[PDB]
Amino acid sequence: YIFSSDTGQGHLQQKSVRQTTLPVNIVEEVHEEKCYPPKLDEIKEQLLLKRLQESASTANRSRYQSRKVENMKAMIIHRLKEGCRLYLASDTPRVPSYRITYPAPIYSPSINIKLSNPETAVAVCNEFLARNYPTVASYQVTDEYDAYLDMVDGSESCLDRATFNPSKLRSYPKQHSYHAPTIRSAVPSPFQNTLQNVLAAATKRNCNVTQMRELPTMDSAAFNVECFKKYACNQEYWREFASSPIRVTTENLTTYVTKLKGPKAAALFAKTHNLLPLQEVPMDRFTMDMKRDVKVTPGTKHTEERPKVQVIQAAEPLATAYLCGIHRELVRRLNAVLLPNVHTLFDMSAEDFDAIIATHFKPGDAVLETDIASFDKSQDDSLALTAMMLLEDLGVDQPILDLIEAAFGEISSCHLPTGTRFKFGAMMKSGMFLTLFVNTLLNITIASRVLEERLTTSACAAFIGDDNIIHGVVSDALMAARCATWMNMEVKIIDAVVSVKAPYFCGGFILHDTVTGTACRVADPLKRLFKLGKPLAAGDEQDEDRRRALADEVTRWQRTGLVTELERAVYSRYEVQGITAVITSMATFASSKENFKKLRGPVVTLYGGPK
Amino acid sequence: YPSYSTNWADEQVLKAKNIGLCSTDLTEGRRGKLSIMRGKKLEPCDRVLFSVGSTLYPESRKLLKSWHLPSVFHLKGKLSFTCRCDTVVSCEGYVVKRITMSPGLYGKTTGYAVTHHADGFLMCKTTDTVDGERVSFSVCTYVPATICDQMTGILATEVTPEDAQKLLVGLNQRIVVNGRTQRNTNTMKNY
Amino acid sequence: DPVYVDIDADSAFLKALQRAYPMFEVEPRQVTPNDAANARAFSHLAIKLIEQEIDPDSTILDIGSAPARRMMSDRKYHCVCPMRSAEDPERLANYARKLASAAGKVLDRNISGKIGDLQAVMAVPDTETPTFCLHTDVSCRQRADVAIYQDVYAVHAPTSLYHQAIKGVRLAYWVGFDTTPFMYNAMAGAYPSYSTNWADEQVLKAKNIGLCSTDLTEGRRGKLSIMRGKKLEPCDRVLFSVGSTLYPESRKLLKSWHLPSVFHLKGKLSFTCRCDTVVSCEGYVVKRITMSPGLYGKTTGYAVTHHADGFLMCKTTDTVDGERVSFSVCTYVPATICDQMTGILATEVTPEDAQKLLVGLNQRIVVNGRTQRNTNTMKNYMIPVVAQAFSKWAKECRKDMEDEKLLGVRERTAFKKQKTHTVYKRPDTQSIQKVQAEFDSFVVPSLWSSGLSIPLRTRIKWLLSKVP
Amino acid sequence: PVYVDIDADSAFLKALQRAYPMFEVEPRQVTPNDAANARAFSHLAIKLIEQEIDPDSTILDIGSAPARRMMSDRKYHCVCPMRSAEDPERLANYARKLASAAGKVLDRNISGKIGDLQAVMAVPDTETPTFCLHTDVSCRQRADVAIYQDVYAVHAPTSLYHQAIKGVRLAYWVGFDTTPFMYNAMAGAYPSYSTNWADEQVLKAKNIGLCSTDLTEGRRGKLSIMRGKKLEPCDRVLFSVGSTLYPESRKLLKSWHLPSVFHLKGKLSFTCRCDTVVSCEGYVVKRITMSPGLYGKTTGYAVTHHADGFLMCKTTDTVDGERVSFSVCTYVPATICDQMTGILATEVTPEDAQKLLVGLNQRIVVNGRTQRNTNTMKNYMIPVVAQAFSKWAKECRKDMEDEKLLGVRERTCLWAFKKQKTHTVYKRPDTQSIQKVQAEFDSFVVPSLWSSGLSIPLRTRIKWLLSKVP
Numbered sequence A: 001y002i003f004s005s006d007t008g009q010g011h012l013q014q015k016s017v018r019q020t021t022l023p024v025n026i027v028e029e030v031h032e033e034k035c036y037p038p039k040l041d042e043i044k045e046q047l048l049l050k051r052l053q054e055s056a057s058t059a060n061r062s063r064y065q066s067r068k069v070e071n072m073k074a075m076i077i078h079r080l081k082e083g084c085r086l087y088l089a090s091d092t093p094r095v096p097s098y099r100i101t102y103p104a105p106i107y108s109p110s111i112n113i114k115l116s117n118p119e120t121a122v123a124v125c126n127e128f129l130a131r132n133y134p135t136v137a138s139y140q141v142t143d144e145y146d147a148y149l150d151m152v153d154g155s156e157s158c159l160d161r162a163t164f165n166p167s168k169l170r171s172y173p174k175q176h177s178y179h180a181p182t183i184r185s186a187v188p189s190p191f192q193n194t195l196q197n198v199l200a201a202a203t204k205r206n207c208n209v210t211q212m213r214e215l216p217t218m219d220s221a222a223f224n225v226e227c228f229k230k231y232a233c234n235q236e237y238w239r240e241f242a243s244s245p246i247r248v249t250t251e252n253l254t255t256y257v258t259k260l261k262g263p264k265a266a267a268l269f270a271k272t273h274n275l276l277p278l279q280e281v282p283m284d285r286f287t288m289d290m291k292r293d294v295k296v297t298p299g300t301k302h303t304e305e306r307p308k309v310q311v312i313q314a315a316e317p318l319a320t321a322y323l324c325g326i327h328r329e330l331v332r333r334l335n336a337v338l339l340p341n342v343h344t345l346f347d348m349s350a351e352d353f354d355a356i357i358a359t360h361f362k363p364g365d366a367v368l369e370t371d372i373a374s375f376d377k378s379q380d381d382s383l384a385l386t387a388m389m390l391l392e393d394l395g396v397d398q399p400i401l402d403l404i405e406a407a408f409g410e411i412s413s414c415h416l417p418t419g420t421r422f423k424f425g426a427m428m429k430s431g432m433f434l435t436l437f438v439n440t441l442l443n444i445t446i447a448s449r450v451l452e453e454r455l456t457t458s459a460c461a462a463f464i465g466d467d468n469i470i471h472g473v474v475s476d477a478l479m480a481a482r483c484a485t486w487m488n489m490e491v492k493i494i495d496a497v498v499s500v501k502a503p504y505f506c507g508g509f510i511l512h513d514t515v516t517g518t519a520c521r522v523a524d525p526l527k528r529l530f531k532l533g534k535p536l537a538a539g540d541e542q543d544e545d546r547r548r549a550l551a552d553e554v555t556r557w558q559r560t561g562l563v564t565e566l567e568r569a570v571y572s573r574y575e576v577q578g579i580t581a582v583i584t585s586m587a588t589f590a591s592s593k594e595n596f597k598k599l600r601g602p603v604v605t606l607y608g609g610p611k
Numbered sequence B: 001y002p003s004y005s006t007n008w009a010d011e012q013v014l015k016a017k018n019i020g021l022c023s024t025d026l027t028e029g030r031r032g033k034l035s036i037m038r039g040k041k042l043e044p045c046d047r048v049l050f051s052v053g054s055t056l057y058p059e060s061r062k063l064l065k066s067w068h069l070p071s072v073f074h075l076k077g078k079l080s081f082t083c084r085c086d087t088v089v090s091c092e093g094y095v096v097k098r099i100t101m102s103p104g105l106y107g108k109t110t111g112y113a114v115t116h117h118a119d120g121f122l123m124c125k126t127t128d129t130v131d132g133e134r135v136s137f138s139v140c141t142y143v144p145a146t147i148c149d150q151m152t153g154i155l156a157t158e159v160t161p162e163d164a165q166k167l168l169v170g171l172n173q174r175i176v177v178n179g180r181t182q183r184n185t186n187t188m189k190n191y
Numbered sequence C: 001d002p003v004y005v006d007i008d009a010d011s012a013f014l015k016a017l018q019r020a021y022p023m024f025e026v027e028p029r030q031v032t033p034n035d036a037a038n039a040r041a042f043s044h045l046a047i048k049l050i051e052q053e054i055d056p057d058s059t060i061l062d063i064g065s066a067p068a069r070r071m072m073s074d075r076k077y078h079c080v081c082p083m084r085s086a087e088d089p090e091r092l093a094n095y096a097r098k099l100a101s102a103a104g105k106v107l108d109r110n111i112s113g114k115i116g117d118l119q120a121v122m123a124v125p126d127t128e129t130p131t132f133c134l135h136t137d138v139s140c141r142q143r144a145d146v147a148i149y150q151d152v153y154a155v156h157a158p159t160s161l162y163h164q165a166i167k168g169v170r171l172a173y174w175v176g177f178d179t180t181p182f183m184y185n186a187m188a189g190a191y192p193s194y195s196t197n198w199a200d201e202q203v204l205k206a207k208n209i210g211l212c213s214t215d216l217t218e219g220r221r222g223k224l225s226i227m228r229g230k231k232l233e234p235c236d237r238v239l240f241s242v243g244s245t246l247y248p249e250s251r252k253l254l255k256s257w258h259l260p261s262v263f264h265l266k267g268k269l270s271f272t273c274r275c276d277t278v279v280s281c282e283g284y285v286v287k288r289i290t291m292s293p294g295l296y297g298k299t300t301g302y303a304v305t306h307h308a309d310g311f312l313m314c315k316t317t318d319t320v321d322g323e324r325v326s327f328s329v330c331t332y333v334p335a336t337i338c339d340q341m342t343g344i345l346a347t348e349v350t351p352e353d354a355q356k357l358l359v360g361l362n363q364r365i366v367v368n369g370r371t372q373r374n375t376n377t378m379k380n381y382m383i384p385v386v387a388q389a390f391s392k393w394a395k396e397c398r399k400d401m402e403d404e405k406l407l408g409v410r411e412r413t414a415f416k417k418q419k420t421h422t423v424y425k426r427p428d429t430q431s432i433q434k435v436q437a438e439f440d441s442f443v444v445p446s447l448w449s450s451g452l453s454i455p456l457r458t459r460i461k462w463l464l465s466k467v468p
Numbered sequence D: 001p002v003y004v005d006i007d008a009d010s011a012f013l014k015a016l017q018r019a020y021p022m023f024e025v026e027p028r029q030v031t032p033n034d035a036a037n038a039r040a041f042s043h044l045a046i047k048l049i050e051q052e053i054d055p056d057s058t059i060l061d062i063g064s065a066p067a068r069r070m071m072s073d074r075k076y077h078c079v080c081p082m083r084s085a086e087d088p089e090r091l092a093n094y095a096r097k098l099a100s101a102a103g104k105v106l107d108r109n110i111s112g113k114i115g116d117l118q119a120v121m122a123v124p125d126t127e128t129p130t131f132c133l134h135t136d137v138s139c140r141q142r143a144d145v146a147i148y149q150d151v152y153a154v155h156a157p158t159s160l161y162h163q164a165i166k167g168v169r170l171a172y173w174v175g176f177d178t179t180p181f182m183y184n185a186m187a188g189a190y191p192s193y194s195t196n197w198a199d200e201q202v203l204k205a206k207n208i209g210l211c212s213t214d215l216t217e218g219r220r221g222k223l224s225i226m227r228g229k230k231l232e233p234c235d236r237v238l239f240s241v242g243s244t245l246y247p248e249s250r251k252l253l254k255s256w257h258l259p260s261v262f263h264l265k266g267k268l269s270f271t272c273r274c275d276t277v278v279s280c281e282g283y284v285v286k287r288i289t290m291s292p293g294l295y296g297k298t299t300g301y302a303v304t305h306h307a308d309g310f311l312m313c314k315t316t317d318t319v320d321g322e323r324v325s326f327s328v329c330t331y332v333p334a335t336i337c338d339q340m341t342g343i344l345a346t347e348v349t350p351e352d353a354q355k356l357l358v359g360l361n362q363r364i365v366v367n368g369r370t371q372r373n374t375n376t377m378k379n380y381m382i383p384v385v386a387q388a389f390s391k392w393a394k395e396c397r398k399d400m401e402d403e404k405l406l407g408v409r410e411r412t413c414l415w416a417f418k419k420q421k422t423h424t425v426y427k428r429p430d431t432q433s434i435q436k437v438q439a440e441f442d443s444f445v446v447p448s449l450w451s452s453g454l455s456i457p458l459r460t461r462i463k464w465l466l467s468k469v470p
């Protein structure tokens, strides 16, 4: 997710495109990446398969999958191209674009410090938890009978416009096997797929009705786009972009499918026999998915109240494959119209982010961080109109806009195992292929309107998802009065000062180095610490990608000139002392395969076995 | 002269195919043709035709070249004079010249003429088909200064004609100035 | 007291011009699209500085000047105007027309005296007058205190200064181009800030220099030649091109103005002289020379030049009339470009790689959209030459560290001389040369003859016949 | 307030303010001089000296220009013979200034100075309380304070003795530092004042601050003839301050590196001391006090205190087409040296050292507004400095890998010791350097090289210029 996940896969790429070998900033030109067209070959597969049988040590098998997957990719292109005959177009001359590059970052040396006995590391971590979090360290006294306790008490829900069968509401637990954790953090296990959990998750009541597409709604949207184009964008690209539309093209589909992996291509291939046309695919029908992981934050709140259940609304598989070739062009056009001091995390890597903010943040500087998650976007219909107006200005072809618009109105969801039907009104968060883009556009628009001209005169601004940071801005009564037109809790704002109250961004800390004198971003150690106290399901063999992720994260923590700063940042955020010992404990855990085995224990089986 | 929609060509190549002033017809190809006389020579002659937008003007080379006067020259006959020549105004092909005469002989002459280029000047050799026969000859033109400056980066390597054509088309719509971006506004003719 | 210059209001030369003259304030105003605007702005400001510095109660001599531009002046000027060029008749006619036109209106600048003085010289073309003269700098017999030279390259310097000294001249000035490139014995060069190019006659048919012209009809094998040259060395004749104007020069007379710090003049009388540089801006210098009777001190014979920006000289290969040859060129580089290439030149770099870096630094640099490098700092037609020089310079610096030798000793096998293809002078660096510092040749080029024709006298007198 | 002809946004202003914390300094630029930095320091030095001197005494000036001492409220006796090729110009300027202001300024005896000048011009060999035409030895005048401003052409012990017998008890000296010449270097530079100096034998170098060469093809073998086989510094050195050339001698330069205590013995005996009071990146101000009689004892040691980094290394260059080697010295800012301690703990190649130095010079340390990303140090000494650090790190590693016993020395019954290599000398900030010199002088010379001084054509012009005095 964004920077890096627990398995070190992340959402960002790993190729630098914003690096230069000169001590000054240089403007360059954006180019295109050529893609190899797949080709079909059956005679090679037949002979290789027979040659696979006679001798295959290690690389002989790999040639078979590469040949087999390559055949599947060619077949998908041939079938997919025929469906969208009424929307296919050709290549028109492109509009050139330019971008700015920055010099490479400088880092301080790192020294490794670790203990020897792995059991002592567990004792230190347990001592740290008890001293700082007394209630959390005394919760576990028996096994994990959460499923049984949830069945004993009844079902409480707050639904709206839903139907279900009462005869299928039964929640007797099934077999559950896991490994007993060693760290005394009480991280819950993922929930079981039952009808009771589905109703508990859908306990949200956002029933609000306003003017759908009337005159007052249009007036608010018209003002919003005016502020965005006046305080956050330059005027050198609008007229050129309107002349050249964006349409579905063979190159878009060929490039997209080639980027998929093995298993993903096979899954898509299985749904190409009865291929519906593009105009036949419904755009307002979704399916319900439950398989998720619970989210826990440092503190003592999960030992008193049960956490919520996460859900996913999945769209049609063919809908996200026909039109997913226009995401790259939309990103390029958006980056071209933004001001040089306004940045977006799309199409960057970890190193590029460090080089941009290398010489901007210094001690004693005020930074404003604001999130917009706590806001009901379903109350006002103008939030959807504003996004469409921005999309139309960017140069989206007219019939394609109708297909996109159909997914932002009335939608329905269904649960296949139980046949449960749900209906929702205007919704912004979903599982479609424009979710981050629309959220980023709305985040910039909200900030631009509230801050007015204070956004233009700034040193560095970064926007991604629902989080943002703006340099050199404080909190005054003018923004409170402007934002209090409807209510007061639209957004949450926090004031931060470098080297005194470290700013928080995307689950990390922004710190200023001492030896070199440059800014850098590091991860959150407490978030990792609670995560090692999560039970591991039996039969899982993913205990090697996590060790490498921990090893990389530990090295970044032990850089010289950042030990003292990290201590103060954690204390000013969570009011906790003594994290250097925890970091040392993490170092010895991620040193060998056998040292990582001390975080687990004997296997415990519940609700299973007729003995 | 692209800026004034003016084209000129020699009389011997009026039946070309891919120049500004020519006209040809469709043929299927006749292998071998009769030739009463022999050629083997293709050099410019004294006859030149001008076309200023839509009007035709015949000209002569000798009289055209007589007005490219040097800086200092003497006129000595029954009476003697000493005179100079200067250029005051120049704009993409049109120039204004000033000449001042004075009686008597003074100084020394060197017989050199100097022209200052504010725009790129090109002269290349091209292959065309004149009346069904392949020949080669030279052409010349003017290039805007902005295009030439932006063209310096890639000319340090070997570039194929196809690659150069694509970049010229793209460079004809957008340029970079003072760290910012705008349209060219000084475009060149596509033909 | 602002000064108006005839240049564009958005030219990048304003910043350099203002920095060289911090005692004034420069204001732009354009009225003519001249092709040599930069070259005339410097000369206009140089005269203003000189005039206010000197005592306004002395007499000033002009050598080869145009009297038309000295009319509206509150000082006293003695113009020495011989007739040895094709431009003099035009200047003399313009002077007469302006004097008659402005008669009776501006009665403050002594117009009547100038009109009467000009008529007297026309009647008898051998008299010496306070305002006008018709002899040369040697034959003139007028006594004054200050002598001024402006863009004069046709007079031997030690000889001219001595003849001025014996008439009681204690101060002198000289305004012109820098003579440093001619001391290194180069074949061609350029002054890109002022649109000036110069070359030798033997390379006038080159292909890739600033002043040349070649042909296209070619492609043959074998050119019979009678003489076996095998030699390319600079000759006396040198051609200059400022804007769209041509000026022939000679190397010997150009090198005579690169005077040392201290020198002696010996003859019937003896003097000691000193030379100093006051203003320098990308090619133009202003020199002040003082004379004093007697002999004092001792000389050393050394000339020192201070570089504010990079000076470069390299060796290039080109085709002259179809034959491949090699010769040396020189140019100037801005200081900002030189500083930013310090880190790149630490290793060996390919010439094509250096060219790409130079292009980005020149026209593709941005900081905040306010100043940048004005998107054009160095003219684009000299980049390929510069890129070649840096590549060779870096390569030759690495070989030095691989041939480490002992201290205070030298090895003879009888010693080998290495090869040098690039001379690079970085900013804040000085160069020293050896010249002559003792002059005693009292040559007498005294063959006096008038150069005024009867028809020209009639025209000048007729223009002054009518008082309006 | 004191006004200095310096650019309003220069980096030298901060350093100048720290050296003079008793004044307030403001910039006012009226001339684009190439040696503005060198002139500002001298102007402030004179103000400091006049602030701690009793205004009742008289001050001698050795080799001074009378033009710049006119509008002062103190008493000066100018001693100036005619031995330089720029002296007659100074005398003419002095006469012109006096005549141009005869009744406008009533500061002091302007008419008296005019009368004094006329008396000296009438008869040359005369003594006047304002002007003189003798040397520092032949002059006969009583005073209390003597000032030497940028004097490098006289012997220090000899000149001081002759001033002491006349009753002078306090002296001052303003000029360049002497330490680089005590190390017997071949070339050097002062980057802050744009000054480069080099030996006469290496004037045809290629990559130093003061040289000039030409292109050659590479002819292998020219001559054998005279066998040089040796390259050592000579007594002739050339200086270049911005754009002016100055020839100097090594013997006279090294004679001003006086010890802390020394004795002057002769017909009369004196004891005296030397001390440095002001130091700023190359310029120093020295104060000397003398007293009759012989007291104490001497040791013969000179000590200098380094506030910045002093570097001396060995370099390889090509002089007139032939490869040679010699030593070069320079100065380094303190901030650069401090930020380099961590890197020098290992073995670093010269290529890496160049890259870090460039990055530190532009991005780190230095910044600003509008005028942004200035340079802390000049870029034409970066290649030389980078190589010096590389050799220093290598030499510090061999010392730890080859240990010796405590309190003993290892020899080789013939016994001898081996000498190691040394290619770099580096003096870090807050470090002292000590040298051994002579502190007992008892031999003096009294020549009579003063025939006439002036000439008749110059005297007539001066009288004519002063003739129009009313």
Ligand SMILES: Nc1nc2c(ncn2[C@@H]2O[C@H](COP(=O)(O)OP(=O)(O)OP(=O)(O)O)[C@@H](O)[C@H]2O)c(=O)[nH]1
Pocket: C036, C039, C040, C043, C087, C151, C153, C240, C242, C245, C247, C249
């Ligand atoms: N090499 C050389 N340069 C000259 C000479 N005379 C003038 N220049 C320079 O030419 C530059 C452009 O001035 P011009 O275009 O000649 O016009 P002008 O000097 O105002 O007057 P004219 O001499 O009548 O042309 C001047 O700034 C001079 O520095 C010369 O005799 N030789």
Ligand SMILES: Nc1nc2c(ncn2[C@@H]2O[C@H](COP(=O)(O)OP(=O)(O)OP(=O)(O)O)[C@@H](O)[C@H]2O)c(=O)[nH]1
Pocket: D035, D038, D039, D042, D150, D152, D239, D241, D244, D246, D248
């Ligand atoms: N090595 C050396 N430096 C000198 C000498 N005299 C002056 N300087 C320095 O030269 C610098 C600039 O002075 P200049 O302008 O060149 O000499 P000037 O023409 O006599 O005028 P001043 O500035 O008053 O000295 C001064 O700061 C001195 O430190 C000298 O005799 N030898």
Ligand SMILES: Nc1ncnc2c1ncn2[C@@H]1O[C@H](COP(=O)(O)OP(=O)(O)OP(=O)(O)O)[C@@H](O)[C@H]1O
Pocket: B107, C063, C064, C065, C080, C081, C082, C083, C084, C085, C086, C088, C136, C137, C138, C153, C154, C155, C247, C248, C249
């Ligand atoms: N000995 C001299 N004394 C005074 N003026 C002179 C002298 N010689 C030449 N001049 C003047 O210098 C100016 C330049 O003319 P010059 O004699 O050099 O011939 P040119 O070829 O026209 O110019 P140039 O050779 O400098 O290119 C003329 O106006 C001339 O009157």
Ligand SMILES: Nc1ncnc2c1ncn2[C@@H]1O[C@H](COP(=O)(O)OP(=O)(O)OP(=O)(O)O)[C@@H](O)[C@H]1O
Pocket: C297, C298, D062, D063, D079, D080, D081, D082, D083, D084, D085, D087, D135, D136, D137, D152, D153, D154, D246, D247, D248
């Ligand atoms: N013995 C002396 N006493 C007083 N002044 C002296 C003496 N010798 C030289 N000077 C003064 O030194 C000044 C210039 O120095 P010098 O006489 O050595 O001439 P120089 O050739 O310029 O040498 P340098 O460049 O080292 O100064 C002159 O003004 C001169 O009056």
Ligand SMILES: [Zn+2]
Pocket: C078, C079, C080, C128, C132, C133, C134, C135, C140, C141, C142
């Ligand atoms: Zn005369």
Ligand SMILES: [Zn+2]
Pocket: D077, D078, D079, D127, D128, D131, D132, D133, D134, D139, D140, D141
């Ligand atoms: Zn005296």
